[PDB]
Design a protein around this ligand. Structure first.
Ligand SMILES: O=c1[nH]cnc2c(CN[C@H](CO)CCP(=O)(O)O)c[nH]c12
Ligand SMILES: O=c1[nH]cnc2c(CN[C@H](CO)CCP(=O)(O)O)c[nH]c12
Ligand SMILES: O=c1[nH]cnc2c(CN[C@H](CO)CCP(=O)(O)O)c[nH]c12
Ligand SMILES: O=c1[nH]cnc2c(CN[C@H](CO)CCP(=O)(O)O)c[nH]c12
Ligand SMILES: [Mg+2]
Ligand SMILES: [Mg+2]
Ligand SMILES: [Mg+2]
Ligand SMILES: [Mg+2]
Lengths: 227, 228, 228, 227
């Protein structure tokens, strides 16, 4: 059953649970030398993220089977997630494809913006191609992280206007924060503790998007790169 | 060594890999999605060679920019794959040689640009509107998948200029030897390719084939099948 | 569809990718280790294309063996890279389509074999002795990096036969169009290449160049520099 | 300083510590469907292993700098480790190389065998090319795992005969078992709990070498594939 109750996560499998004290020393992995003073520890290594995304793609493929759906990348932060997910989905679909098979997905990009420093401004700006191209489509939203859940409640509310057939959510990280509004995704990678994470395309003020691993920015990093 | 700032002149550009008119590989030489075979004539550039060439391209870029902050601008949707592999190699190269005193090399931007229907330019370019004044006084590197007619870049560079950017240089994965070409050159260029419409590595025919790993030629049956 | 069992005849083998006499790329098209440039003339087959072709080769192998247990035999040292990429793609392909009732596809074996000094065969083959009776009554797939003179395989297949194996088939990454060739054919073959001594992708000149990612031609200066 | 006191690990950095209760559900990652009944959980995902090996290669490169050394792959189980380590070492060395630079390493293969089912037989068989080629060389031994430490004490004892200049050890896993003889490596990936692991080239009776992740074989798997 293709999901279609955004925020409920009706039949979602549990994420990898990342505990409050989980993670690794900066010296356990490769870290850009200059980034090292601004990071407290590695939370989730690049490699686990890729391994986990692979399974998500499989989970997704198993739900949609062969139904055409349309993947929306919520830019800029979900870019890493989205490229990884696409890679894996294509390989899984195309490895099992026969001569009579069909293409599986279309791809679309929406820039979504709300954060200043480490907090939501509680407002939301969006820029995309005209979303009327989604009318009557199965749509899969790909979001790097769910934090307050404001981005998605607000974004999914906007999507209701355009007569989309189904809306489902894939999320890489979900943060256990008391600021969360209850928005659950339908496919979820990791549940993480309440700290601001950078890397794997996630930023603090346009910095760290290039960091391979998901890490916790320390206070000095937050101060140095404050808006 | 200087940062390019003559968009379209490619003043000091290295030669791309030249792909001859007869170059290519049979579909059965490589992995090809089963349903796609009947719509392709051949593999023009394998995924792996594309990736190895993006790697060198990123090294060229780093040899020009050095440690100078620049802003990388992705022309969606077709440049995604190119842009992705480029970020990956640039970061590794920049971050491998980085020292504790170093700083990040680039910012990343996305503009969606559209002009094709089937295998031809409509001659009009749709630019999805975003305020680009964050780029005022910045070095910008445009990342484009392909130069064909050159219309996309001629028009987009006019647009960009109005934002009072410091410099504009162009990274292009493919450049097509078509008579339609208006003469727009890139400053870093992956391959020079024969005049055939290509799909794969994020390049589509009517939203189809983007997921195809290799750069291949769509055949006429596929062009008719997927006509808009 | 049947398991090959005529070592050297390549009875039903698919055609390899043909690399023409003039095929290749300039060293500056790809990443090349700085100290290696002066010893190479050109890139013959980029790393990425090698990898894409091993992928298809593994698919061919799986289309022949299906779910039948077989034993993969790595001819060290030069076949390591080839063997590695082959294991990777075979497992993914086998394990992606696997069901809960499935079983593993293959075992993996290693024999070290040696016969070259500089760029020529000594005409005598050193086989590092191991008891291979674990292979009695088994399908064995030999993985060899290159067929040149064909001496390695002719001799090694004689050796292997004494162990009373069920079948012997050959996977070869490269096969060289040299007049020295004794006619030994493989059953799965990656590329047919011109008659030049090649290095990279685990293939050496006197233990040098194995780490080089691309298959390139060593020049005469490098052959003289590293002469034994 | 190139290490040269095999078993002491004189100046070794601490490994990633993998706790007794650490790991992931089989359903968190891709697992060959048929292997799933024979595995209790994932211990260390493929991706963390690769990320960790990358840093080891860096650690190694930093010690040897530009001195020629010779890498010995202890077959069959250390194959995955060895190929990963080589990949990363070459890229790190060749990325920083200049025109006047030199090749960094030679490579050699030694088959070492001692286990039956999940235990050492307390004997050791070895097959390699003539190790006299190591005379006067810096040698780096690459071993997938240290368990009883019998393989390496015995192997390093054999190497003393051949006038090797230096012997250093790189190890991917070290198991916290009371059966351990005290042999420490000089470069170490992970400290792991006391269970028999499979995957990433590590087997139980030639099975599981192809499993991407490092996992704990369950009792049913041990029984099914008993010698
Ligand atoms: O821990 C973090 N790190 C980096 N970026 C973010 C963001 C910003 N980006 C998120 C959408 O891409 C906001 C999700 P919302 O509206 O539910 O808080 C939130 N949390 C973090
Ligand atoms: O051969 C092709 N294959 C697939 N897509 C395209 C496109 C569509 N996209 C190009 C910008 O990304 C148009 C470039 P222009 O304006 O210079 O002709 C052009 N040629 C090809
Ligand atoms: O062009 C080359 N480059 C590098 N190494 C080799 C070798 C060495 N190794 C080959 C077996 O792996 C010899 C194959 P044979 O006995 O059929 O000539 C042969 N040709 C080349
Ligand atoms: O947990 C495990 N899993 C798989 N294989 C092994 C082996 C077998 N292989 C090791 C050398 O490659 C033995 C190391 P030693 O002599 O110190 O016990 C030991 N432990 C394990
Ligand atoms: Mg952000
Ligand atoms: Mg297009
Ligand atoms: Mg050789
Ligand atoms: Mg074993």
């Amino acid at each position: 059953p293709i999901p279609n109750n955004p925020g409920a996560g009706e039949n979602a499998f549990d994420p990898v649970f990342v505990n409050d004290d989980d993670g690794y020393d900066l010296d356990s992995f490769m870290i850009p030398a200059h980034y090292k003073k601004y990071l407290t520890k590695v939370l989730v290594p690049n490699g686990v993220i890729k391994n986990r995304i692979e399974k998500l793609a499989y989970d997704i493929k198993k739900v949609y089977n062969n139904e055409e759906f349309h993947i929306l990348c919520l830019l800029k932060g979900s870019r890493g997630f989205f490229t990884a997910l696409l890679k894996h989905l294509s390989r899984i679909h195309n490895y099992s494809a026969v001569e009579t098979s069909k293409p599986l997905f279309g791809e679309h990009y929406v820039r979504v913006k709300s954060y200043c420093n480490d907090q939501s401004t509680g407002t939301l700006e969006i820029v995309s191609e005209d979303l009327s191209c989604l009318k009557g489509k199965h749509v899969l939203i790909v979001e790097d992280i769910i934090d307050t859940g404001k981005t998605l409640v607000k974004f999914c509310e906007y999507l209701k206007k355009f007569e989309i057939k189904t809306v489902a959510i894939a999320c890489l990280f979900i943060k256990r924060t008391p600021l969360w509004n209850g928005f659950k995704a339908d496919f979820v990678g990791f549940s993480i503790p309440d700290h601001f994470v950078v890397g794997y395309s996630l930023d603090y003020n346009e910095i760290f998007r290039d960091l391979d691993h998901c890490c916790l920015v320390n206070d000095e990093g937050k101060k140095k790169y404050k808006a």
